[PDB]
Design an enzyme around this catalytic site. Structure first.
Site, PDB file in Angstrom:
ATOM      1  N   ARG A  52     -10.443   4.024   5.357  1.00  0.00           N
ATOM      2  CA  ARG A  52      -9.971   2.650   5.150  1.00  0.00           C
ATOM      3  C   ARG A  52     -10.465   1.676   6.200  1.00  0.00           C
ATOM      4  O   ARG A  52     -10.436   0.461   5.979  1.00  0.00           O
ATOM      5  CB  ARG A  52      -8.440   2.601   5.000  1.00  0.00           C
ATOM      6  CG  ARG A  52      -7.846   1.253   4.598  1.00  0.00           C
ATOM      7  CD  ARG A  52      -8.404   0.670   3.301  1.00  0.00           C
ATOM      8  NE  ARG A  52      -8.206   1.482   2.099  1.00  0.00           N
ATOM      9  CZ  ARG A  52      -7.064   1.610   1.416  1.00  0.00           C
ATOM     10  NH1 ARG A  52      -5.951   1.012   1.822  1.00  0.00           N
ATOM     11  NH2 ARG A  52      -7.033   2.376   0.324  1.00  0.00           N
TER      12      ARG A  52
ATOM     13  N   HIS B 179       2.849   2.769  -8.822  1.00  0.00           N
ATOM     14  CA  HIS B 179       2.055   1.903  -7.965  1.00  0.00           C
ATOM     15  C   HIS B 179       2.468   0.467  -8.236  1.00  0.00           C
ATOM     16  O   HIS B 179       2.732   0.115  -9.388  1.00  0.00           O
ATOM     17  CB  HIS B 179       0.564   2.077  -8.253  1.00  0.00           C
ATOM     18  CG  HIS B 179      -0.321   1.673  -7.117  1.00  0.00           C
ATOM     19  ND1 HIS B 179      -0.760   0.376  -6.938  1.00  0.00           N
ATOM     20  CD2 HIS B 179      -0.845   2.393  -6.096  1.00  0.00           C
ATOM     21  CE1 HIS B 179      -1.511   0.315  -5.854  1.00  0.00           C
ATOM     22  NE2 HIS B 179      -1.579   1.526  -5.322  1.00  0.00           N
TER      23      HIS B 179
ATOM     24  N   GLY C   3       4.151   9.989  -4.863  1.00  0.00           N
ATOM     25  CA  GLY C   3       2.861  10.313  -5.455  1.00  0.00           C
ATOM     26  C   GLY C   3       2.748   9.761  -6.861  1.00  0.00           C
ATOM     27  O   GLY C   3       1.742   9.981  -7.545  1.00  0.00           O
ATOM     28  N   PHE C   4       3.786   9.032  -7.276  1.00  0.00           N
ATOM     29  CA  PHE C   4       3.889   8.493  -8.633  1.00  0.00           C
ATOM     30  C   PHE C   4       4.248   7.013  -8.657  1.00  0.00           C
ATOM     31  O   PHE C   4       5.099   6.557  -7.896  1.00  0.00           O
ATOM     32  CB  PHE C   4       4.877   9.315  -9.468  1.00  0.00           C
ATOM     33  CG  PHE C   4       4.341  10.649  -9.869  1.00  0.00           C
ATOM     34  CD1 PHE C   4       3.672  10.805 -11.073  1.00  0.00           C
ATOM     35  CD2 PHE C   4       4.465  11.748  -9.023  1.00  0.00           C
ATOM     36  CE1 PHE C   4       3.140  12.039 -11.446  1.00  0.00           C
ATOM     37  CE2 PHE C   4       3.938  12.988  -9.382  1.00  0.00           C
ATOM     38  CZ  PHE C   4       3.275  13.131 -10.602  1.00  0.00           C
TER      39      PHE C   4
ATOM     40  N   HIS D 233      -8.743  -1.320  -0.810  1.00  0.00           N
ATOM     41  CA  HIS D 233      -7.716  -1.584  -1.824  1.00  0.00           C
ATOM     42  C   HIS D 233      -7.069  -2.964  -1.721  1.00  0.00           C
ATOM     43  O   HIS D 233      -5.842  -3.096  -1.798  1.00  0.00           O
ATOM     44  CB  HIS D 233      -6.646  -0.484  -1.841  1.00  0.00           C
ATOM     45  CG  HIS D 233      -6.216  -0.113  -3.223  1.00  0.00           C
ATOM     46  ND1 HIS D 233      -4.895  -0.043  -3.601  1.00  0.00           N
ATOM     47  CD2 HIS D 233      -6.939   0.174  -4.332  1.00  0.00           C
ATOM     48  CE1 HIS D 233      -4.820   0.297  -4.876  1.00  0.00           C
ATOM     49  NE2 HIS D 233      -6.048   0.428  -5.344  1.00  0.00           N
TER      50      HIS D 233
ATOM     51  N   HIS E 228       3.608   3.727   3.321  1.00  0.00           N
ATOM     52  CA  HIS E 228       2.268   3.181   3.162  1.00  0.00           C
ATOM     53  C   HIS E 228       1.187   4.263   3.217  1.00  0.00           C
ATOM     54  O   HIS E 228       0.594   4.590   2.190  1.00  0.00           O
ATOM     55  CB  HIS E 228       2.015   2.067   4.183  1.00  0.00           C
ATOM     56  CG  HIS E 228       0.720   1.341   3.995  1.00  0.00           C
ATOM     57  ND1 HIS E 228       0.215   1.018   2.752  1.00  0.00           N
ATOM     58  CD2 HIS E 228      -0.167   0.857   4.897  1.00  0.00           C
ATOM     59  CE1 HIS E 228      -0.936   0.384   2.896  1.00  0.00           C
ATOM     60  NE2 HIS E 228      -1.189   0.272   4.188  1.00  0.00           N
TER      61      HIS E 228
ATOM     62  N   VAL F 237      13.365   9.320  -6.090  1.00  0.00           N
ATOM     63  CA  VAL F 237      12.000   8.842  -6.236  1.00  0.00           C
ATOM     64  C   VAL F 237      11.101  10.010  -5.876  1.00  0.00           C
ATOM     65  O   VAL F 237      11.222  10.572  -4.787  1.00  0.00           O
ATOM     66  CB  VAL F 237      11.720   7.632  -5.309  1.00  0.00           C
ATOM     67  CG1 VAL F 237      10.216   7.365  -5.175  1.00  0.00           C
ATOM     68  CG2 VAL F 237      12.453   6.383  -5.817  1.00  0.00           C
TER      69      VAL F 237
ATOM     70  N   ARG G  60       0.895 -19.897   7.043  1.00  0.00           N
ATOM     71  CA  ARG G  60       1.980 -19.814   8.025  1.00  0.00           C
ATOM     72  C   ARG G  60       3.231 -19.170   7.427  1.00  0.00           C
ATOM     73  O   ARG G  60       3.898 -19.777   6.585  1.00  0.00           O
ATOM     74  CB  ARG G  60       2.312 -21.206   8.584  1.00  0.00           C
TER      75      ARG G  60
ATOM     76  N   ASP H 155      -2.536   9.635  -4.316  1.00  0.00           N
ATOM     77  CA  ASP H 155      -1.904  10.511  -3.350  1.00  0.00           C
ATOM     78  C   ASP H 155      -1.284  11.754  -3.952  1.00  0.00           C
ATOM     79  O   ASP H 155      -0.734  12.578  -3.225  1.00  0.00           O
ATOM     80  CB  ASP H 155      -0.862   9.742  -2.536  1.00  0.00           C
ATOM     81  CG  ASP H 155      -1.496   8.742  -1.583  1.00  0.00           C
ATOM     82  OD1 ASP H 155      -2.505   9.080  -0.909  1.00  0.00           O
ATOM     83  OD2 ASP H 155      -0.973   7.611  -1.514  1.00  0.00           O
TER      84      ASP H 155
END
Lengths: 364, 364
Positions: free
Chosen positions: A325, A249, A246-247, A175, A210, A243, A344, A300
């Site tokens: 992943r 992005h 699962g909803f 991803h 995450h 919030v 940097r 998810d």
């Protein structure tokens, strides 16, 4: 933009995902996960002959070193399964270290070893600590997902559970730039070893903002007795500015393309079992989340239903994320080494101005 | 604008370094490392009473759990020492895990445990793997630095070595954003645990471009038997556009304020021991790099000499950088959790444009 990549494109149309140019829809439909792992790690969709050799190679890499077994047996039952994987990989890094040349070829061999053995690391720790058994990691199972399920349940999974596992892992493989992948790249960029770059990545993916997501998607989905009472409680929770995980992005503006795939899998898995309870609840709250907040479900959301139908314990959701992943990570680590451009990182200061030193007796 | 920090300023004047507004020149002259640890981890320069208690607390945190010992014993003698720390800290996270709340107070407890036992982890492994001995890590030494040297050498160090360790570790304690620190903040920004953030930071610091520049500095200085000879070879390499490790800095445009301090330390160590061959070469090469490329020496140039005079094996250079910098990382972990703002990086895409899927039996 933090770096250049040839690996992955996502959200240019608001709802597309590609691995090295190939559509995820096509990849999920036709490929075994191993084909996708070969695409990422080894650069290309394998021929039939390349696949055979690769699957035999992976099949022989499922074992655990005597000393790694000793390491795993020392980790208590209450360990975060993510920390178990982190320790096992770390121990393995000490045991089969990368050669100080850091060849592309050597990087892939480690990738391939990790990929084949992460299941073994997790489940061997799990069955020893939880059940007091030293299981056999080296099964006759013909796929990574199937090996996973066998080692989890103590028996070979259905052809059905194995295929759905192929689809799950493929959807999770890559991803582009996110917290864990970016971490792997920052670590690769210092000239550090594959294991270390994978071990930082695992630590980032452990964070619930995450890699944790679907663990709580399942927690929301299991709260409710019926689709009606889920609807009522969620629109109550959204009106109170909660919030719902699962909803939504960061990148996608229209849809998560992996969602429609995983919903279809969840549906079939729920049907084949005979129970579409949890699926109808997830499907309802999906409608409700759109009415209320104009949010689409991400991968998810329904992966929760599909995994749970396959009897995956909640605390093993993220570990599966790592088995999938690690293939993107390994691709990104290798890519970072080849064009080792570094950006940097620098900060904005908000602390106190220069101030004189206070001596130890002077500060009481 | 990667993130906000209240911890450290670097090179605002071109040659300047401050930890929470305190000048590094003052800290290195007047502070036990324990005092700088306290400044970064607990927020303030301690009163005498607070130091007494902090040292009593750290002295009693030097122990190694039964299971963690067993882990370290399985790591072969040839492990990278950084990979040993990585593993040890990993197993400890399974053993004394952070409570799910991730409170500030619990984070500092883990940073303190880690600060006190990192030396125990490293050296118990070394002395078991290399010498077949189970050492006692819970010694009566009254400083981290002095504790390190005791477990390394098997004897309490001289007062002079103890004070030199104090200074070195102060110098390496914190340096704003860089690969290892930024890694710690990325991992922390997912809501992950302190061990995971620290373990990734270790991975980053293990890269030779980031953590072990003083190891190659030592290799350089030890190529030569005389200043005259050292000067001839380096000025030949410089003419041939070679990079000389230990010189320059991405942030400092005038000088590394840490260099002057470690140069003095290295001068006293080299004179107390007897040999100045290495110092006179390092000091000579400094002059050469100035005349030839107007490059100033950074901290990693003379810290080689000073650590060498204290009998520190080269492979323990970066492990000692971890003992020092774990204070900065811990403070940076705490900060990212407070003023939280995602991870969020993106890439530019260079890979193949959308291509058709070729089914496996039709690939060539």
């Amino acid at each position: 933009p933090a770096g250049n990549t040839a690996l992955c494109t996502v959200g240019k149309s608001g709802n597309d995902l590609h691995y090295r140019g190939y559509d995820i829809l096509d990849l999920a439909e036709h490929c075994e996960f191993e084909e996708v792992a070969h695409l990422l790690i080894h650069g290309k969709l394998p021929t039939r002959d390349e696949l055979n050799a690769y699957k035999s190679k992976l099949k022989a890499l499922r074992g655990l070193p005597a000393n790694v077994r000793t390491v795993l047996e020392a980790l208590p039952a209450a360990s975060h399964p993510m920390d178990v994987m982190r320790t096992g990989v770390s121990a393995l890094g000490c045991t089969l270290p990368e050669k100080e040349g850091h060849t592309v070829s050597g990087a892939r061999d480690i990738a391939d070893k990790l990929l084949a053995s992460l299941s073994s690391i997790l489940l061997y720790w799990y069955h020893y600590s939880h059940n007091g058994e030293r299981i056999q990691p080296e099964t006759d199972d013909d796929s990574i997902g199937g090996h996973f399920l066998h080692l989890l349940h103590g028996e070979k999974p259905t052809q059905s559970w194995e295929k759905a596992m192929h689809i799950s892992l493929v959807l999770y493989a890559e991803h582009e730039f996110n917290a864990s992948t970016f971490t792997s790249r920052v670590i690769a960029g210092t000239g550090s070893d594959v294991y270390s770059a994978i071990i930082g990545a695992i630590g980032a993916l452990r964070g619930p903002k995450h890699g944790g997501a679907n663990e709580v998607s399942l927690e929301i989905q299991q709260r409710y007795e019926t689709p009606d009472e889920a609807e009522a409680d969620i629109r109550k929770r959204v009106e109170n500015k909660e919030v719902v995980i699962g909803f939504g992005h960061p990148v996608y503006t229209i849809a998560d393309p992996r969602h429609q795939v995983i919903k279809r899998v969840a549906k079939q898995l729920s049907e084949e079992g005979g129970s579409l309870k949890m699926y109808h609840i997830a499907d309802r709250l999906e409608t409700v989340m759109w009415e209320t907040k104009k949010m689409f479900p991400n991968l998810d959301w329904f992966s929760a239903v599909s995994y749970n139908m396959m009897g995956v314990p909640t605390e093993m959701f993220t570990p599966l994320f790592v088995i999938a992943r690690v293939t993107g990570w390994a691709a990104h680590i290798i890519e970072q080494r080849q064009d080792n451009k570094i950006i940097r990182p620098s900060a904005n200061y908000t602390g106190p101005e220069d101030r004189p030193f206070v001596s130890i007796d002077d500060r009481c």
